[PDB]
């Protein structure tokens, strides 16, 4: 999109004490947005909230919670880092932000021709070329010193991240009580469960919705494949709210009778997860009589 | 095309350009805000709820969440327009050009005339400036365009936090787990698609019978004949039956089994003398 790319184009405001506020905003806001998107799309942060919903009593201690935020923030921080790296490697965001802090006395590649009356003002205007031609050499001397530091931090940030990933994945396997092969089978189960469950939820809702539409008009218009779903997958009712509440939340490898349990849905299906009426449509049957 | 007609053109006149900027930006933000309301079906069943009660029976709490969802799902279009119009910078340099103080101007010696300060400043966006003042034309333009883009990124940041805080509060304060609401959402989409699609088929089958009663036959295509054969209609649904599935609904649970829509509430049988707008008077009055 040629028009929409020019919208997010970096336009350095060549003014002192002003070009780093823009540099912080033009880089820190997209990094913040990518951080928020990573949190929102991650399902592991909503069952953490759902854990805090029904427990309501700080039941989870620091040990399980800190190992959940580390997973949420570790997976979320991938996008801001890969944006904070590209911006540093480009060099535009750093030369604009730091052009006013270059020491005029430390300049080189020429004799001391640099003015001292308005030094911060002229320096801040280097990224926009708006410089006198007698300082053209000084402009490129600064334009390379600051771009070097921008890429020096860009490669150190890549190097530091590539070590934290190595240390994290090394400590995750060392400290986990499970073997790395079972955690690979566990990860394959959680992928297959979270895919089949969504697939059946769509079908079990369409079949349930078809029954309600049939109850209104007397017939339902269904496609060639939708008609097969009604006969192949008949529904009889809706799952109770406490049954839904028994499969949503965090889970850390509880094992039963020497046999592993790999999810809350798995733990519920074994029967190990299963008076006062809440949020009912109408009052008690005794009150209905009056 | 349209972009040529709706292209932004800054009127370089003091105390006059920002009015144009308000109209060239605030009106498309209003129109996109109106369109979001109209297209959102959740704003019409809210009206239907007020239509039948006629006594303000519902409290503020059911309405406050209902009204919030309508605005939130519709305020996206103005924001993605207000942000773009702010990151472009054209609509803000034009509006705030005349408010720039010549006293604080730099990047040039103090040659700024004082006879007409506001008049000259307001003419910067149109490049109708003397060449002796051209150093300030780029100086003023960069200062204002920076604030235009600075506000754009803060608007994105604030919006990207309100979305996060809204979704976090929606899940925490909801009485249902995030998976049941996911299933509930997958039900409403499936019901609406099925309900509208049968309503089209039901009308066509009903219309065919009316046509057959008139001409003695109906001219159907190959697929329409299947619709008549497969789906025979026996009558029409009463108005109170229709009125039992229109309005707002907030997860009423029956006998421990959830209900996911008013149609589902009606299908279970939990929703269903004085005659209004009748074609003909009372049967006794028809005789007289």
């Amino acid at each position, epitope marked *: 999109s040629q028009e929409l790319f020019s919208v997010v184009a970096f336009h350095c405001p060549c003014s002192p004490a002003r070009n780093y506020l823009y540099g912080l905003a033009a880089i820190g806001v997209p990094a913040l947005v990518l951080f928020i998107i990573g949190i929102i799309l991650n399902n592991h942060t909503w069952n953490l909230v759902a854990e805090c919903q029904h427990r309501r009593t700080k039941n989870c201690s620091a040990a399980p919670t800190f190992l959940l935020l580390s997973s949420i923030l570790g997976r979320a921080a991938v996008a801001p880092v890969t944006w904070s790296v590209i911006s540093l490697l480009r060099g535009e965001a750093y030369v604009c932000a730091l052009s006013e802090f270059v020491d005029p006395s430390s300049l080189t590649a020429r004799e001391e021709h640099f003015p001292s009356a308005h030094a911060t003002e002229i320096l801040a205007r280097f990224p926009c070329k708006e410089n006198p031609d007698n300082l053209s050499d000084f402009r490129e001397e600064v334009s390379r010193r600051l771009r070097y530091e921008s890429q020096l931090f860009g490669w150190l940030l890549i190097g530091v991240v590539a070590i934290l990933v190595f240390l994290t994945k090394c400590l995750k396997h060392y400290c986990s009580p499970l073997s790395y092969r079972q955690e690979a089978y566990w990860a394959q189960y959680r992928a297959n469960e979270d895919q089949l469950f969504q697939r059946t939820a769509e079908v079990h809702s369409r079949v349930l919705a078809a029954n309600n539409v049939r109850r209104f008009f007397g017939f339902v218009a269904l496609n060639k494949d939708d008609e097969e779903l009604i006969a192949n997958f008949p529904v009889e009712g809706t799952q109770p709210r406490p049954q839904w509440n028994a499969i949503t939340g965090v889970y850390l490898y509880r094992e039963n009778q020497g046999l592993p349990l790999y999810s809350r849905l798995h733990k519920w299906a074994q029967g190990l997860a299963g008076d*006062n*009426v809440e949020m*009912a449509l109408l009052p*008690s*049957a005794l009150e209905v009589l009056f | 095309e349209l972009f040529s007609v709706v292209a932004f053109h800054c009127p370089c006149s003091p105390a006059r350009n920002y009015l144009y900027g308000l109209a060239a930006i605030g009106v498309p933000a209003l129109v996109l805000f109106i369109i979001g309301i109209i297209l959102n079906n959740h704003t019409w069943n809210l009206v239907a709820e007020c239509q039948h009660r006629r006594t303000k029976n519902c409290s503020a709490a*059911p309405t406050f969440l209902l009204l919030s969802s309508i605005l939130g799902r519709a305020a996206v279009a103005p924001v993605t327009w207000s942000v773009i119009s702010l990151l472009r910078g054209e609509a803000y340099v034009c509006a705030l050009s005349e408010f720039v103080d010549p006293s604080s101007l730099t990047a040039r010696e103090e040659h700024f005339p004082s006879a007409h300060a506001t008049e000259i400043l307001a003419r910067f966006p149109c490049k109708e400036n003397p060449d002796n003042l051209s150093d300030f034309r780029e100086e003023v333009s960069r200062r204002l365009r920076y604030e235009s883009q600075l506000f754009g990124w803060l608007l994105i940041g604030v919006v990207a936090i309100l979305v996060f805080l809204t979704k976090c509060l929606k899940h925490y304060c909801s009485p249902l787990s995030y998976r049941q609401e996911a299933y509930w959402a997958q039900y409403r989409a499936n019901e609406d698609q099925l309900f509208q699609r049968t309503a089209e088929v039901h009308s066509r089958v009903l219309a065919a019978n009316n046509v057959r009663r008139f001409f003695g036959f109906v001219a159907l295509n190959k697929d329409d004949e299947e619709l008549i054969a497969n789906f025979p209609v026996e009558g029409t649904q009463p108005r109170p039956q229709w009125n039992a599935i229109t309005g707002v609904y907030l997860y*009423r649970e029956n006998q421990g089994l959830p209900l996911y829509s008013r149609l589902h509430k009606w299908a279970q049988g939990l929703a269903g003398d004085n005659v209004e707008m009748a074609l003909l008077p009372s049967a006794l009055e028809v005789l007289f």
Partner: nanobody
Amino acid sequence: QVQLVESGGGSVQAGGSLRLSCAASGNIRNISYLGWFRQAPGKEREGVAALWTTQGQTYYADSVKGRFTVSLDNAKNTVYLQMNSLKPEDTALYYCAAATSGQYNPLRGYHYNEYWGQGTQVTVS
């Protein structure tokens, strides 16, 4: 917390006299609902009668007014009834229930407490 004890089931012909005792044990201090329900195979459950402790008025079904009467032992905190003119329509499972006059917050909906007790009563003829 509240357990209901019921007895008095039997098999009597038409016109027989039967009495069903619903014994309530637990926290009945917040109970405002006392009555009986019947259900038979092949159909749903209906309520023959119900009593309010707090308001004091009482309900009877259409086939129960003048045919069955329900009494409350306030001192004993139990429910008693009388069965008169037994009919084949009375062959159903009888239960006694209770409730706590559930409030209503418009955001969530009605919420209350309900209890049940399993009993049987069939008339041979």
